[PDB]
Amino acid sequence: MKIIKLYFESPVHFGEKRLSESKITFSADTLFSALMIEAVGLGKEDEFYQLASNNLVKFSDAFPFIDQYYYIPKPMFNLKLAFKKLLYVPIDSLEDYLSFNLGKLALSEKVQQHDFKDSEPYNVGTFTFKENTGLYVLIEQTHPLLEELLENLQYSGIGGKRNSGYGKFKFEILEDSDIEDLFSAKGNRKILLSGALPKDAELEQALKNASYLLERRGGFVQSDTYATNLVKKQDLYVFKSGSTFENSFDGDIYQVGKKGNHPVYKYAKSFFLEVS
Amino acid sequence: MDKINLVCGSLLHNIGKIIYRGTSERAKHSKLGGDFIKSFEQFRNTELTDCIRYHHAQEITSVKSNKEKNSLFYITYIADNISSGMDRRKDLEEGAEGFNWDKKVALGSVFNVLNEKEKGRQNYSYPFVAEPLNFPTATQNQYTTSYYDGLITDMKTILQRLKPDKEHINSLLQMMESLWSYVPSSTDKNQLVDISLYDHSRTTAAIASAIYDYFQAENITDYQKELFDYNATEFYDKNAFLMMNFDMSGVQNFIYNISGSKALKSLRARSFYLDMLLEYISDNLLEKLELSRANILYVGGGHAYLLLANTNKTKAILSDFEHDLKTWFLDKFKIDLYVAMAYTEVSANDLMNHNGHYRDIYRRLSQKTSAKKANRYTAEEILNLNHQGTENARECRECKRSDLLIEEDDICEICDSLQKVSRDLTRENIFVIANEGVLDMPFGKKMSALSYSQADKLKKSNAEVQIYAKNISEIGQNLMTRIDMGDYTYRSDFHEMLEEVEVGINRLGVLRADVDNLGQAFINGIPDDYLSISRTATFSRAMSRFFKNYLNQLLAEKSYKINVIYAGGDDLFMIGAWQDILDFSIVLKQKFADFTQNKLSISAGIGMFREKYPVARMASLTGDLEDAAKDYTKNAVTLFDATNVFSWDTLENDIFVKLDAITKNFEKLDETGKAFIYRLIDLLRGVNENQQINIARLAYTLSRMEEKIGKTFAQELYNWANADRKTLIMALEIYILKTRE
Amino acid sequence: MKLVIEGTIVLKTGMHIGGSSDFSAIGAVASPVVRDTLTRLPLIPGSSLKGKMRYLLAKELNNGIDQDEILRLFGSSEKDKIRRARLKFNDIKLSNLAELETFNVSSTEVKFENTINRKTAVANPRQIERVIAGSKFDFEIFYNLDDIKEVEKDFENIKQGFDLLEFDYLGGHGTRGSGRIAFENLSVITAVGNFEKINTLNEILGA
């Protein structure tokens, strides 16, 4: 199981509800949406969907990482038992569990001027990473196709505010074996690592002793082909990445657009870190 | 035989003792209670009379067979026992003619016991001034019987407008919080003089109704054998109390779920709306529990702790209330708002605090609340919540939400209702709920929030209609209950507000404050030895009471050009002229220190912006400023920037004595300011990087203008610019900002 | 398949870009220049360069009387027609701080300025922070080579916009003598795919 490390040399804007604020990381269907839009840039979008639909391409979402420390969101248990301010724990320090600051959020103030009229300002929330940090994306069984797409994505930009002028990155794989054995392990409680949602006939079996938050996950369709306007998406509600489940489930790539000239998918497949 | 008699025997209790401590009748107080009975509307049945004149143990054993069973004063006896926190087994109770009871002693302050293991045991009391503006102090106090007979004449000339029945408990409770807020619970016994007897009566009413419904469900007989043929422990070793709670999560992201134009109005709208939703949700639960409002311990910002009975019928109605409230939030606020109702069971011995075990009752309730918070929605709720998704070409701009949008305009129905109702909202305005209103509330009854206008005529025959009030005057058929919300507004136009100022720079100053270390102080603040439940109720209710009424009165007594957006312990946001904001921050800090006996800290952040500046970016910037203040991890304040963080005494003392000295000195000088002050600030901010040569230039300029600015002021500036430097830069900056024409 | 338009921006005058909401002290600089929030190195935001090129290119075409060329270069969100933006700008950071350290001067300055009321004849001073002249700015702009038959007109338009921006300011108070830039060391390189006639793109732009 491989690593995908993302080094940003420019600020990022990962919006979650509005342009004025931003988020440290980006989700999994955000990266999958970027890969779909770039694959239909290359025309190979159909067999990329047939790869990601049949589990050979299965990635988690982005996580913070500092120099030789890979992080995850604080897994949230039914713990009966200060470190309550900390949002991220190192990925190998879960056994110890049972200082940290990457970057700083900034707000960039912009304007749009009209020539024979008064101007109008708008402001963009940004995030800038420190010099020896960034984000990393977990992936198992790397494919030549996704190695080609991320090689091609880095000149289009992950992030929100494009193409002015923020999201750009250079990636490298840099596989690791100190944390592959964590994912080869098996335990009794399995934490989630991506924004996921089980299929309708297994949500009950997935929902037994869980600890989760829903997140709304919608927005606008970003294409020049979906139905001659800016149509919103069917707001899918997926589990938060810092969830825990005692029993596993497998997600689906749900179609959240069913009215334009092409389908709009949303990645909601599961990715577990099994722990005792 | 219903609980009106018992709740009146609890709430109307110990009036005979508070008149016993001032009026000379040295006989047994049972005859005083019985003689006080018949001087009302009519004398009641024997139930309430025996409830209020039999709670003395020898008289209890003296009256067995001359009257019937179903005592209904055994309840109030062990109710006073459990609400007291200690035992009265066979001893003579208070004022029982057993010793020379010389009762002239005032009410002790709540904050003396608070955190006595870190800073020792202080002691204070509550003085009396003939709401309103008063503050507890460390001097001995005394009450006089003339004011007592005056207040009882007022109480009995306005009291007869109510009927001793079910619905009038609210109105007598409103007059009880008007009157009994400062009268003590007892005279001696320091373990009892810490709390006022008004909340002791509220607690006694709650626990009396709880044990009454407990015995109504368990269907038991012979209360005399059960409770007195053994010494009242066999009740205590049974589970009979359900102390449940409420917890709205994510209130902050719904208050600040605004990005539109009208962001001033929507902020106060949402901050009022969450509180009023919690109010009606709690009151409707008590209404469906056929219960009075005395069972509320505390309602705050997002939290509502309760005390009910432990019966299976209450469990069934609690689960039904769960399902209805959860479905109603999932209809309106998709995942945004969520209440976490969890009940915890305690035995009657368990809250007597003899074996301890009270802070872990709060801890267990927190564990169950977090457990329900971890697993929020069930399977079909998530399935329905994903299936109701649809795509549209419109959204609202605050609530970025693609359903329940109005026609011809693109703002969501709550998202516009909040703006409109925030527009028509003043001080003396009344809040009303019915089946027709504006703002959505469960279970299908809305809120109108209409003023004194052509729609006042609903209060005639206002069946199934409730009234939420700011002021209370009429206690006949009005029935207005108080909701604590603070909405001081000077002018409501920022341009007129600034235009009235003609002394300083034309800027708009912004205060954001919050109480730091409020969390563990609210959860576990009162120490385990002298630990009470009504003390915590008074603590939190007094905190919210302080912020609301003393904030409006402190801003009313001096004409401060400050618009309050919303107040509270957790949150405070005021926009006004910067002169009044700076001059009021020290006032608010010192009045909070006087109210809390300076052991609850407070931090704040002052920001300063121009006349026409957006309120959303204003609030975010000043919130950043006060976060930098609280990061220091003690009490402090930031003046206009994160680089200028000062402690409150440091700001007050150092900056304001330096500012007042500078203002005295440069006024009498005929031609010195302000060019000398700008050169002085230039040197005193260049000295941060080039430390030596600017100190030399400073000495050169001060002896240069020794003959001009003053002999002693120049050497004072030279002394201050080496000892406490960074203070004097801010003192000079706010001096010029004050004196710019 | 994708191209990289790389050059340098050399300042001939000030170029004060941007306004933060940072609080200004009373005797100090109001309206500071935009910077990196973490390096505190002066910066040209890519939205500023993009907006100024769009302004000059849109004012150039349709002379005194928008068009498919401008929308296909810099995007569109019109209700009827939506086109993906071919150009991809980046925030330009300062590059020659090694050279400006050699000259023993900071990369930023304060310009002192006032207005004078014409009736009351009282001055009204202001300080504006401003990048110094002689600064360099390595910029990368990425082009989406989605159509081959239009790349010649596209790169002609890009060089036209660069030349129009050579005779006009880049950001801030340019009418009072600021913001004058020049583009030197312009080159085009591909990163993925392979464009055959990359040389005519290099010659239409680096001429």
C-alpha dist (Å) from residue C98 to C9, C38, C136: 16, 19, 11
Of A155, A164, A224, the CB nearest to C50: A164
C-alpha dist (Å) from residue B242 to B6, B212, B282, B295: 19, 14, 15, 11
d(CA B504, CA B500): 11
d(CA A205, CA A198): 10
- Is A103 within 8 Å of chain C by CB? yes
- Is C95 within 8 Å of chain A by CB? no
Going through chain A in order, the beta strands assigned E by DSSP cover 2-8, 58-66, 69-73, 88-90, 104-112, 120-128, 133-140, 164-165, 169-172, 189-192, 214-217, 236-239, 244-245, 252-257, 264-268, 272-275
B275 annotated to a ligand binding site: yes
Structure tokens at B213: 């419904």
- Is C84 within 8 Å of chain B by CB? no
- Residue pair B304/B276 in contact by the 8 Å Cβ criterion: no
Interface test with B, best of C20, C22, C23, C122 (most B CBs within 10 A): C23
Counting other chains too, the contacts that A35-42 makes at CB distance below 8 Å and 24 or more residues apart are A35/A146, A35/A149, A35/A150, A35/A153, A36/A265, A37/A222, A37/A223, A38/A149, A38/A152, A38/A153, A38/A156, A39/A149, A41/A152, A41/A156, A41/C144, A41/C146, A42/A149, A42/A152, A42/C1
Counting other chains too, the contacts that B467-472 makes at CB distance below 8 Å and 24 or more residues apart are B467/B430, B467/B431, B467/B432, B468/B276, B468/B279, B468/B430, B468/B431, B468/B432, B468/B433, B469/B430, B469/B431, B470/B427, B470/B428, B470/B429, B470/B430, B471/B428, B472/B174, B472/B175, B472/B178
- Is C193 within 8 Å of chain B by CB? no
Of C18, C84, C90, the CB nearest to A165: C90
**Among B466, B451, B145, which Cα is nearest to B287's?**
B466
- Dihedrals φ, ψ of A160, to 5°? -95, -60
Give the type of residue at B465.
V
Chain B touching partners, 3 or more CB pairs below 8 A = A, C
d(CA B625, CA B618): 11
Return residues 682-701 of B near C (CB < 8 Å). 682, 685
Give the type of residue at C104.
N
Q: Which residue bears the tokens 């001097």?
A: B139
DSSP 8-state symbol, A67: T
- Is B616 within 8 Å of chain C by CB? no
- Is C60 within 8 Å of chain A by CB? no
C-alpha dist (Å) from residue B52 to B48, B68, B73, B228, B295: 6, 16, 7, 18, 20
Going through B33-91 in order, the beta strands assigned E by DSSP cover none
Nearby residues of B234 by Cβ (< 8 Å), 6 or more positions away: B226, B227
Please, what is the Cα angle at C161 between C159 and C166, to 5 degrees? 95
- Residue pair B127/B60 in contact by the 8 Å Cβ criterion: no
C26, closest residue in chain B (CA to CA): B733
Give the type of residue at B137.
T
**Among B243, B173, B161, B228, which Cα is nearest to B205's?**
B173
Please, what is the Cα angle at C196 between C192 and C198, to 5 degrees? 80
Interface test with A, best of C48, C56, C84, C86 (most A CBs within 10 A): C84
B571 annotated to a ligand binding site: yes
B517 annotated to a ligand binding site: yes
- Sign, Cα dihedral of A20, A24, A26, A27: negative
A17, closest residue in chain B (CA to CA): B400
Residues of C in contact with A145 (CB under 8 A): none
Write out the DSSP string of B584-637.
HHHHHHHHHHHHTTT-S--EEEEEEEESS--HHHHHHHHHHHHHHHHH---S-E
Residues of A in contact with B375 (CB under 8 A): 207, 210-212
d(CA B415, CA B398): 7
C-alpha dist (Å) from residue B392 to A37, B130, B404: 22, 63, 11
- Residue pair B164/B4 in contact by the 8 Å Cβ criterion: yes
Alpha carbon dihedral B728, B733, B736, B737, in 10-degree steps, equals: -140
* 3-state SS, one letter per residue, for B388-424: CCCCCCCCCCCCCCCCCECCCCCCEHHHHHHHHHHHC
C23, closest residue in chain B (CA to CA): B641
Give the type of residue at A63.
F
Contact call for C146 and A41, based on CB within 8 A: yes
Residues of B in contact with C122 (CB under 8 A): none
The arrangement of strands across the sheet holding A189-192 comes to A244-245, A189-192, A272-275
- Is C49 within 8 Å of chain A by CB? yes
Nearby residues of B248 by Cβ (< 8 Å), 6 or more positions away: B274, B277, B278, B302, B303, B337, B338, B339
Structure tokens at B708: 């001009």
Structure tokens at B9: 């025997």
Residues of C in contact with B737 (CB under 8 A): 26
* Cα atoms found within 13 Å of the Cα of residue B11, Cβ hemisphere only: 26
CA distance, residue B374 to nearest chain A CA (Å) = 5
CB pairs under 8 A between A and B: 65
Alpha helices in B289-375 (DSSP H): 312-332, 359-374
- Is A41 within 8 Å of chain C by CB? yes
Number of helices and strands (H, E) in chain C? 5, 8
Contact call for A232 and B392, based on CB within 8 A: yes
d(CA A193, CA A138): 9
Nearby residues of B740 by Cβ (< 8 Å), 6 or more positions away: B504, B505
- Residue pair B188/B100 in contact by the 8 Å Cβ criterion: no
| Start-to-end C-alpha separation, chain C | 23
Write out the DSSP string of B106-175.
-BPPGGGSTTHHHH-----BB------S---BSS-----HHHHHHHHHHHHHHGGGS-SSSTTHHHHHHH
Residues of A in contact with C2 (CB under 8 A): 152, 155-156
d(CA A240, CA C37): 30
Chain A touching partners, 3 or more CB pairs below 8 A = B, C
Structure tokens at B44: 């009641």
For chain B, breaks with the C atom over 2.5 A from the next N come after 130, 632
The length of chain A is 276
d(CA B718, CA B6): 74
Nearby residues of B623 by Cβ (< 8 Å), 6 or more positions away: B512, B605
Structure tokens at B477: 């058929």
A37, closest residue in chain C (CA to CA): C84
Contact call for B391 and A18, based on CB within 8 A: no
Residues of B in contact with A247 (CB under 8 A): none
d(CA B429, CA B427): 6
- Residue pair B702/B717 in contact by the 8 Å Cβ criterion: yes
Residues of A in contact with C52 (CB under 8 A): none
Resolution for this model in angstroms, one decimal place?
3.0
Task: Check which CATH number belongs to the domain holding B594 and give it.
Answer: 3.30.70.270
d(CA B178, CA B186): 19
Residue B132: asked if its preceding bond is cis (omega within 30°), the reply is yes
Q: Is B19 left (phi over 0), alpha (psi -120 to 50) or beta?
A: alpha
Give the type of residue at B603.
S
Residues of C in contact with A221 (CB under 8 A): none
Q: Which residue bears the tokens 């056994």?
A: A95
3-class DSSP state for residue C127?
A: strand
- Sign, Cα dihedral of A244, A246, A248, A253: negative
Give the type of residue at C149.
K
How does strand B466-469 pair with strand B481-482?
parallel
Determined by: cryo-EM
How does strand B603-610 pair with strand B637-639?
parallel
Residues of C in contact with B736 (CB under 8 A): 26
- Is A109 within 8 Å of chain C by CB? yes
Q: Which residue bears the tokens 């991809």?
A: C88
B248 annotated to a ligand binding site: yes
- Residue pair B574/B563 in contact by the 8 Å Cβ criterion: yes
The length of chain B is 741
CB atoms within 10 A of CB B180: 23
**Among A222, A225, A196, which Cα is nearest to A210's?**
A196
Write out the DSSP string of B546-586.
IIIIIHHHHHHHTT--EEEEE--SS-EEEEEEHHHHHHHHH
- Residue pair A242/A25 in contact by the 8 Å Cβ criterion: no
Residue A95 CA to its chain's centroid (Å): 25
B369, closest residue in chain A (CA to CA): A78
Range of the domain at B522: 494-651
d(CA C134, CA C181): 10
- Residue pair A241/A195 in contact by the 8 Å Cβ criterion: yes
Of B335, B378, B616, the CB nearest to A216: B335
* 3-state SS, one letter per residue, for B683-718: HHHHCCCCHHHHHHHHHHHHHHCHHHHCHHHHHHHH
**Among B412, B645, B618, B386, which Cα is nearest to B512's?**
B618
- Residue pair B479/B467 in contact by the 8 Å Cβ criterion: yes
How does strand B645-646 pair with strand C2-11?
unpaired
